Subunit: 218 residues, 3 copies
């Protein structure tokens, strides 16, 4: 028999579980990309239609706040995790496992998957996330930091551009909205996303939140 | 331990040699990504060297007047009926094959592949009349890197025989090899001849298997 | 029959063994990073406190000799009776050890290695007479050089430096390179600068390459 994705019998990943157990529906399973001992398995969502292994961020969100003050009114990319007070870089997999173990489990998926993708949602109050309505351009768009020392941007090297799935942040309305970003690649080493650098921030009324989506490997 | 049959695949040919030194060179089933046995691939194992050799699909580019019109032209990216070379059991989904290859490419000590260019009135490497390799074809590897007659010596191919040096109205062939300790660079996925586009100028290609150690 | 680190039942690596048998103490174990066939397992030292997998050099040491007679000079490449350092069971073929090491890197977030330079009238790191490091030795990594200065990503750190002065006596300097990019290890060669007068001599203890 071939492991069925339970904690006692984790599969290698969700693709293997799909291949060997095509009866199983999308949901929560345990996978062990590094094989060997079963005890360091990680808990994931398996999309059984696509075969994707999806690992949630912990924590899932960055609360909505006035995170950055720069009263010189200068606008500049500022990394949330690297530079902001209360800042953290994004983390993935079972919080009860050692960080080193999670890093290796992710490394197996990042290095040896055919592709990967991840969405991230920026919650905005008076903060352009991508397009600025006044200008019609994306010069004020935020950046994302990948996992292979690379950045995902609105423009530039086309191998490194994200795409925007919706964009409700184009004007300062004094209200809350959101923009959803996605990076999709055949070089899964570049994922997951570990940081975000908003540009249109620093003013007294400028605020943001973040919902970090699961990194999904095929 | 695994015997290399379809129902019991070995991780790769090197393991199969190690664990069964009595087995002889031939067709076996290997499963580099391990885990579930069902996505195993069919390969040739050289049991003298331990190499895992995966055949291209399809095996070859048939001989013809492929191109009309001097510069490198990618067969797969730019020619009519052009296609890139792929590898592994065609009944398996492409993402699954990518993964099986990735395991071999990332984690082998070395890899090699031969390509044979069949030529009629087409220089492949050396031009006998000029005495240079400026008209030499190019190859496409798997990390978007090119293999060439010259340049960075980490990305140059070698030539094992060269019968394509003159236009003679007859058919001949030149055999190219890329060999590397950085196996992510292989397999070869496209070829760009240079000395083509004339009426009389025809070519074919035999794509050798990518062999991992 | 959960893998136990014996030759017949090797674990994948030291952390894997620690995870499956956390009562086990540090010492020598058989691990098999590439899995599949158990017969190409490698004998390693498992630090069971940290979970590190440590592979010894073979040979362990360069003996104390007047190695060079009158530039940085590579021990393995240029010196009479010199050799590059190698890792893993010598009775396993090189291509197989290469594979085991490739897997060990994948199973690792980070790696480290120490190397001890035994010196007589041979500056290793700091030169007392000049207050500077210009004469400091260099190490050859896998894939890449480790140096006293230059790019930060590639600088080693020094743990003791007793080689600062020509004293006529034997002393030693301890080097360490640590990185997330485990492809850069292990160390394969060593390049001392301050050699060799008739007086000048050295030896080396290559410490295990350690993966976590
Ligand atoms: Ca495991
Ligand atoms: Ca498999
Ligand atoms: Ca093995």
């Amino acid at each position: 028999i071939s492991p069925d994705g339970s904690r006692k019998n984790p599969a290698r990943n969700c693709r293997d579980l799909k291949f060997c157990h095509p009866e199983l529906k999308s949901g929560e399973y345990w996978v062990d990309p590094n094989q060997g001992c079963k005890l360091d398995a990680i808990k994931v969502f398996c999309n059984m239609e696509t075969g994707e292994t999806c690992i949630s961020a912990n924590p899932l969100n960055v609360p909505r706040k006035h995170w950055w003050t720069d009263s010189s009114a200068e606008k500049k990319h500022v990394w949330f995790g690297e530079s902001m007070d209360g800042g953290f870089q994004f983390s993935y997999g079972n919080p009860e496992l050692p960080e080193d173990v999670l890093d290796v489990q992710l490394a197996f998926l990042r290095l040896l998957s055919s592709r990967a993708s991840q969405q991230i949602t920026y919650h905005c109050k008076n903060s352009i996330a991508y397009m600025d309505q006044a200008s019609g351009n994306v010069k004020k768009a935020l950046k994302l930091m990948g996992s292979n020392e690379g950045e995902f941007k609105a423009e530039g090297n086309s191998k490194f551009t994200y795409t925007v799935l919706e964009d409700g942040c184009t004007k300062h309305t004094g209200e809350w909205s959101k923009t959803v970003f996605e990076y999709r690649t055949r070089k899964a080493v570049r994922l997951p996303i570990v940081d975000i650098a908003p540009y249109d921030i620093g003013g007294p009324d400028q605020e943001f939140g973040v919902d970090v989506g699961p990194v999904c490997f095929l």
